[PDB]
Amino acid sequence: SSWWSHVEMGPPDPILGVTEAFKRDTNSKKMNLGVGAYRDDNGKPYVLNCVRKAEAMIAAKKMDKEYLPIAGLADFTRASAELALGENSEAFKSGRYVTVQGISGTGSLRVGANFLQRFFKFSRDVYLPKPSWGNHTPIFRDAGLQLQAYRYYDPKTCSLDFTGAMEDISKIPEKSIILLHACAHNPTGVDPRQEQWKELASVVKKRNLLAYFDMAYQGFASGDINRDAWALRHFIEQGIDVVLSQSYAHNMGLYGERAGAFTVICRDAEEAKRVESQLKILIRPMYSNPPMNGARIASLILNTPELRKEWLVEVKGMADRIISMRTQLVSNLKKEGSSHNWQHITDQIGMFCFTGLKPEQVERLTKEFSIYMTKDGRISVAGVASSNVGYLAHAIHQVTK
Amino acid sequence: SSWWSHVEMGPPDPILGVTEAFKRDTNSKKMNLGVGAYRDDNGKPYVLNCVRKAEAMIAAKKMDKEYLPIAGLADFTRASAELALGENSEAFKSGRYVTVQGISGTGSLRVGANFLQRFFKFSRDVYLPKPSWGNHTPIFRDAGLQLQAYRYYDPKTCSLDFTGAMEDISKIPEKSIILLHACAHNPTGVDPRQEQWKELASVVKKRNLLAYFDMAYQGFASGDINRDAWALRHFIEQGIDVVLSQSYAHNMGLYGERAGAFTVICRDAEEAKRVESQLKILIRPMYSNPPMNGARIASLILNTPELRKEWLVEVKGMADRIISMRTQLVSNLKKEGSSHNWQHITDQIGMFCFTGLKPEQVERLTKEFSIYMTKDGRISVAGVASSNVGYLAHAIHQVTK
Ligand SMILES: Cc1ncc(COP(=O)(O)O)c(C=O)c1O
């Protein structure tokens, strides 16, 4: 019959708009600063050498394709927890955590959202920083939670509004949920420094808030897996039992294979088995059991010393290329005669950078220079290469001079 | 803390318990008839030759691991639509269908369920047959719909309660949702014959019911992909715009890779685009995009003549082993001197068989013969092999005589 006549055409994604225009452009100097995945120095997708080798191992073993347990590959969940909490972590060693494999970071955040909706009886409010990854809204919203926000980004300085953040967080009703980015805040790239993190943890402890860490870039951010997980670990050291989402999309370049994990820090191993049974019950009617390919690759790497070692070098390489590009962009802006302060470009961390450009300026950048970005002045640093950093520098100077 | 103290231990999975108790048994005669996946004649997992050939082809190309679009691999979704509807299906050729890649059968069912909750304004009720796959319930329940039922299985004769089905469907409120298993009904193995399907279509047409088909065993049930898709194709052909879920778990043996799809039959190409946009809005906050490996493997086989040709041979090979084991069970039961009527075993279709055995008899089989199965009397034919079929007939005879 005519069941669907009332379904309206959904709104178009702006990122898709930028990508389509970029593809149409004929100018060979075109840059795509809307990319959400790492690109090497030649602007190409990069499959890690350690993933090629792990894949090669799998094939040689003639593995079956049987269904994985609901919670996922045990070797993968254990390794994920170890990676995040630290091998000599008290939480890890006493077994008071529960980790289940999720569909990358997004599926892992959703399982968590769904878990909180069902069992977190104290509140339905989730406080997100201003701004946050766009998908974070519909994720918590479709799950049944209420969205709240706390000040985070300071447009005046293109850095942390520490004063605004501490004031907001201090007024959060106790036992509410606060979403924190572990590192490489998406989309601004501004992260608290260690001393700021110490103040932040004191207050969440004091106000007895449930801390939900989104850790989508461990290793990929600064090049150091322990450094990137520092604030998460500090929070747990201070006695804050968090919930966390992990993604292997960026740090292992496993994008389409969807490898990720969801973890809950419990009081003890007893309590962990209980929440693990509830997590299994929720997941079965969602998708029954997780996709095995990304987890088998991730597991092999983390668990095989030779591989793990090669992985840390390559993840460091990715991080270093991006720091390199941020470094190069501010020196070339000085070189061009920009009198403006571009240090936020080097203070920011990870793949996304909030530049401070205004909408008028990004339009000119697109129209006249064939540099494609979203109107919020957000740039994907994976889109810059050694061959075009100078150009971008030039282009930025011209629209801000 | 003490966020999770009130979270209790969830109930034990009864399938888990049979498999597990099966493991703990020492008897060299032991048999696991609770297995949910195909097993060869030696009781081993079976990865198809055609899938090993596709995996080598993917390996040779050195493909990237970039994210697939939200809706999935286009070569996969089109081929999936084509296998279900038929190449010269009117619905296929006009392009009045929308096919989205889902996480195997279960995630496909669930995005479907969530789509209905959000856009099916006509009703909140879904009518499942009595009985249906266990997971069908939480799927719809967690999605937000209300469960209802229609008589299906006749315990008295271990066949279809055709009359009861027809009376129950005739009375379903107009514009209700009805779930139909396209073939090889789970868990009984009882399917309507071609003429009863015809009669069912007309009532569904008359009551103006939204028919949701669950097609998890296309090709794997009878050895023939067209015959297995007969009922679906008939409904579309009579002008019933159906909703469908497909799984490649069993027919391609892709279990853990998670390849499946969800399709909606629309009025035209224009409406298909509107519904496709909303489905994307829905999936994004669920898991962002689907896993690429299973979809890549399945797209190659379906799209490559030589591989598709091989695949058809293997799926038939699987269906025949199953039919052979059904046939041999009945003959051995007769040979044993059993006087009960066991024709239902040969009348049933697919991997699952409702034997008619009572709880205490199942218990007798477990305790004295080392035969593991659920207390509902359902056996998974995959666990029967040429070398133990004799044994199984004998035990069943001893317990029922
Ligand atoms: C803040 C943030 N969270 C989570 C993710 C997870 O993406 P995926 O679903 O590929 O794991 C990303 C990157 O897309 C992200 O930037």
Side-chain angles (χ1 to χ4, degrees), chain A residues 1-11 13 15-16 36-39 45-47 51-52 55 58-59 62-68 103-104 106-108 110-111 114-116 118-122 133 135 138-139 142 175-176 208-211 239-243 249-250 253-258 264-267 270-271 273-275 277-278 280-293 296-297, chain B residues 1-11 13 16 35-39 45-47 51-52 55 62-68 103-104 106-108 110-111 114-116 118-122 133 135 138-140 142 175-176 208-211 239-243 247 249-250 253-258 264-267 270-271 273-275 277-278 280-293 296-297:
Chain A
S1 111
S2 73
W3 306 118
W4 319 120
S5 58
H6 56 117
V7 12
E8 297 175 354
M9 178 70 81
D13 161 71
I15 285 172
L16 165 157
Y38 180 72
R39 288 299 174 262
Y46 172 68
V47 178
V51 350
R52 284 306 185 209
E55 288 180 308
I58 287 150
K62 291 312 196 159
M63 290 183 105
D64 65 48
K65 274 183 200 301
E66 302 291 297
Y67 290 122
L68 277 192
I103 317 303
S104 217
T106 311
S108 298
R110 187 59 180 271
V111 166
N114 271 62
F115 178 78
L116 265 25
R118 195 170 281 190
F119 298 103
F120 193 77
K121 70 188 213 281
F122 325 90
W133 180 31
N135 211 26
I139 286 166
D142 293 358
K175 303 189 220 163
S176 306
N208 196 44
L209 256 44
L210 186 269
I240 314 192
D241 293 345
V242 309
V243 301
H250 294 82
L254 251 37
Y255 303 95
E257 300 279 0
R258 318 309 288 144
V264 13
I265 299 293
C266 293
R267 212 165 150 297
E270 162 295 312
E271 178 165 279
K273 304 279 157 188
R274 291 192 273 93
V275 341
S277 78
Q278 293 302 328
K280 292 192 217 177
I281 290 176
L282 242 201
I283 287 168
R284 199 175 20 221
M286 265 189 225
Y287 54 81
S288 198
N289 53 64
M292 88 201 319
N293 203 56
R296 290 172 154 173
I297 292 163
Chain B
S1 294
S2 81
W3 301 124
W4 323 116
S5 65
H6 65 293
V7 175
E8 283 304 300
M9 182 81 59
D13 162 72
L16 209 205
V35 184
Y38 179 76
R39 292 290 172 271
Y46 170 63
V47 14
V51 329
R52 289 305 186 197
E55 288 187 295
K62 292 299 179 274
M63 307 187 68
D64 61 45
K65 286 182 185 305
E66 301 295 295
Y67 292 129
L68 285 189
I103 308 168
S104 209
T106 313
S108 296
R110 187 52 185 272
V111 329
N114 291 7
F115 174 76
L116 255 38
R118 189 166 286 184
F119 296 102
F120 202 71
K121 59 169 160 191
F122 325 105
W133 174 46
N135 209 33
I139 291 180
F140 297 97
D142 285 1
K175 286 177 199 293
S176 279
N208 188 238
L209 259 35
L210 174 287
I240 297 165
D241 291 346
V242 128
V243 128
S247 162
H250 297 81
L254 248 47
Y255 298 102
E257 301 285 351
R258 314 315 285 138
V264 14
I265 305 303
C266 300
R267 189 158 169 300
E270 191 276 330
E271 182 178 89
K273 220 75 179 62
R274 284 192 279 95
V275 349
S277 81
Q278 292 298 345
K280 273 153 58 163
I281 282 171
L282 201 255
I283 294 179
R284 198 164 181 168
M286 277 174 78
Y287 52 80
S288 227
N289 48 70
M292 85 203 324
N293 203 56
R296 282 174 167 170
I297 295 172

Side-chain angles (χ1 to χ4, degrees), chain B residues 309-355:
Chain B
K309 209 153 202 179
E310 185 161 19
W311 173 52
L312 292 182
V313 165
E314 298 173 277
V315 72
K316 178 147 160 59
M318 303 189 286
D320 290 353
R321 199 181 82 71
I322 300 293
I323 291 161
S324 178
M325 294 296 107
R326 290 182 177 273
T327 311
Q328 301 183 45
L329 176 55
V330 170
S331 144
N332 291 308
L333 273 174
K334 274 169 194 162
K335 186 188 139 207
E336 281 293 312
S338 172
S339 73
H340 301 270
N341 177 18
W342 292 110
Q343 85 166 193
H344 49 296
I345 295 190
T346 38
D347 292 328
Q348 288 164 358
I349 293 136
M351 207 181 43
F352 306 106
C353 171
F354 251 45
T355 64

